[PDB]
Design a protein around this nucleic acid. Sequence first.
RNA 1: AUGUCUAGAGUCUGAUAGAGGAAGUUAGAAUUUCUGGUGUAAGGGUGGAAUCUGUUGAUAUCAGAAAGAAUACCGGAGGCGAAGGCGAACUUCUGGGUCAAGACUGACGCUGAGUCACGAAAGCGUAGGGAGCAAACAGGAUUAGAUACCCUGGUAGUCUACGCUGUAAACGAUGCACACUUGGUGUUAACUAAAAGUUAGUACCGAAGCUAACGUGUUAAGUGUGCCGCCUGGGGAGUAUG
Lengths: 97, 63, 132, 88, 27, 69, 277
Amino acid sequence: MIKRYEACFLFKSEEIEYKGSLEEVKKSLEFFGATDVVSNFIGERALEYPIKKQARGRYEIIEFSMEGNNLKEFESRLKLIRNLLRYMILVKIVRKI
Amino acid sequence: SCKFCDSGKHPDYKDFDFLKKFITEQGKILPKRITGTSAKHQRRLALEIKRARYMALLPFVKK
Amino acid sequence: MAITYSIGDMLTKLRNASRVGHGSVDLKMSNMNKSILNILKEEGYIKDFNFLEKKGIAFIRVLLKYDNKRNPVINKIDAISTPGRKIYSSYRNMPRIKNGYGILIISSSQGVITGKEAKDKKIGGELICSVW
Amino acid sequence: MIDKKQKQKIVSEFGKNESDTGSVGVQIALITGRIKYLTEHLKINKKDHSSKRGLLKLVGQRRSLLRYYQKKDLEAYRMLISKLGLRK
Amino acid sequence: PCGRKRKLKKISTHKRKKKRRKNRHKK
Amino acid sequence: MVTVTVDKNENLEKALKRFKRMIEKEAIIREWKRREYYEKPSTIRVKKEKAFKRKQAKKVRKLKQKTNR
Amino acid sequence: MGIKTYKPKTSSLRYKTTLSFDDLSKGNDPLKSLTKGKKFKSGRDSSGRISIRRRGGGHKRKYRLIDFNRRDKFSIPARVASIEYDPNRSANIALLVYKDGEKRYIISPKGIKVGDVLESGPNAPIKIGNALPLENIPIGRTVHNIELNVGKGGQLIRSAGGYAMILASDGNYVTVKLSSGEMRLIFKKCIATIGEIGNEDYANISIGKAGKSRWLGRRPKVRGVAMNPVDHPHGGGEGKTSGGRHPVSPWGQPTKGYKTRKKKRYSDKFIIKRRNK
RNA sequence: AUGUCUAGAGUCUGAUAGAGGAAGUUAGAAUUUCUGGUGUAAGGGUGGAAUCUGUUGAUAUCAGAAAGAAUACCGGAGGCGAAGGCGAACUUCUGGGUCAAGACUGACGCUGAGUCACGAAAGCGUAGGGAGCAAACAGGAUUAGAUACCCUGGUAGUCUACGCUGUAAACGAUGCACACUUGGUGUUAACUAAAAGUUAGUACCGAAGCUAACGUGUUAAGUGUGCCGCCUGGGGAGUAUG
Ligand SMILES: [Zn+2]
């Protein structure tokens, strides 16, 4: 079942590593069959509790579509990216409609 | 007196600077009876605050 | 659903409405309910009853009767026969309810009839209810 | 899950027409599909007990419908059990 | 309730359990 | 982590009055006195039961006194 | 995996259980070009004395040439051909067929199946069965068959059902929690295999009778209090003594708690925190 | 015995609330232990003390590492589930409920002896794990005595996977279902833009009625019935025996 997922990712501070990490994330979704990938940069904020020794990082929102069964596997692969500090994947909002 | 009902926008962790007003000055959630919000909005607001705290958008305790 | 009484449901509704002192009560509709309310009407226990409509379903609206002092005409109305306990009686062994002050209602070969009519026509059957 | 497409598909197969959801054959077929994928789910998640209760309620509903159908329309009942595989 | 009856039941239960504990491990 | 920055010209007295007030408004001391030692969930629930009953009786009491007067 | 139990039709079968070999590509004979017949050992050495006691004549078995050192086959994918029973060790052995035509045996991990493709080297994906230097394996994975010196092969954990936990990495070394439970430093350039070793019911077995213990090549064990004082420090059992002496080995070495590791060994630098009792 | 109907009950459609369940991942606070600095004679504990801990460097304080268990604030005159019960975050799998002209089937229902499934905590078997807490147990106190209350320690257990046990003041001390019978004050969800009302819940007070009384009172313990379970003075006794 194709499901409209929406996810948030945190990357470490410097720009080149941010961009590279985001690139393998994007190719990762494409390999796992994601469709309608759209991003939205949130900025570069100072974290208010340190994560993996870092104190400052850049936030990304990705709103894609993808079938259910590959979430398991996709997740199992997102642990390999060195520069992805934290993230969460959510089903769509409870929109007022 | 539910601010989310008044503004017509619904709680969301991405909108974290707005979330910061329903938090005490070091992270604790405010009660309904104080902030005067509706029950459904309060439940969604608590869930979103927890999500943000998981993303370090919001603090567990200020340091 | 286990209604278990097209008879006792109307009897209970009529009893409740009567003691709280309503003006009318609004019952489900069936041939036996019509027959019973007809007998009530001849016996002067209820004023009248009408046939109605709601959402395509037929109802019976009954006009409760009271004295001028709001004392109900019906004092006690209660079933005798019952799905777990069916009570039949010959036309000789018919009980006279409250020395005749009340009336007994039965279901017999010739229809739903009062006890006096059953005695006068020498027929007996199931004892539906007693009213006084 | 039984998706809307197979739901309507089974309705179309088993009912007299496209709008005949409420007939007994459609009822039994849909409940049988639910039972099958639930026994699959509960084969894996053996410590799931709410789901087992739901499955048992479904089985009871199917037995009730089967008795009513067999009493009322007998030959349709035998055709139905033979087609659906429900042993007797 | 007065609770005396509950106390009676309690002491009865204790004595019965003590009997069973005593006769455990015996054979 | 409750803080009260003391200004250069600000007085110590009101400084720790502010500290005391915002401590009480974080309820740190009550939380610590609550977590001193364990309580059965049963007895938490029962004490809340009884506290609410006391509050209701006291309110009914207060309104009775108000109308009695 | 699984355990198969027996009905008690004899007084010996009452507590006999064996493994069930369902997770094994059965009906199998070993690859003729990799197995050689061999004696049974029984613990005697070149001089002919008994150096280890209580080892005797079990079932005759062939030797299967295993390969714990996959280094000279980096970057070359191979196919899993079969999963076979090995009498010389607890774990099962997988037969890999390499793309260049060479076939080899490896320890069969937990959860691989026939037809899988396996790869070794720095570039290999992180997948159960692949062999990579400890550099490349991410912290938090479970590996097995750890190499101790580059070019030596897997000399660490190898037995059925075991795995090691990677904890941290630093300088030239990686901290690894071994199955005994100690935390040891490993040189980062050695290779390891990803994932646990299959066949984890091997030690849940109840042997059942003295005969099977004899099949496994284990002669009977004679206690020390059944001896005479000429035979063993504990002897002298005129009516069931308990040794009359603090417990010792047959050669006078204490046995209840005595620590026999050398006090100034060379590898002491690489042991962080020893195992626990 | 054979038909007919739709208002009961279901299926389909749409909307919607929810700590419902199972599996797989992740998080921080706090505590304990270990290592490395600063630093000195107490720490800890009680009604009052002592045991204990500490000059082998305590407690306190800073930094780092590791493990386990539990999820403050939200959080309550809440929510869900048949009950037990379920509260950090996410995904996957999955159960149930509620509303409506919004069509379909046409009584397909209620209850249910045996039987089956689930069933807090404690306990048992196998294999792990073990921070904190803590039966048994040890020491120090109180006391005539203290096999306890108090203090310092501390093994099972508490935790995980699988297989058993099937007991609780397992309570609303009130079996389930349906048809009816004035109101007041809050609250949850939905319909309505929202009020305002309705429907389905969930609490307090209360008229009539009922009750031995306490109390109950549209979530009856009121007026009626269907079916099941159970009671017939107390002790002996939930014992003896099977
Ligand atoms: Zn709002």
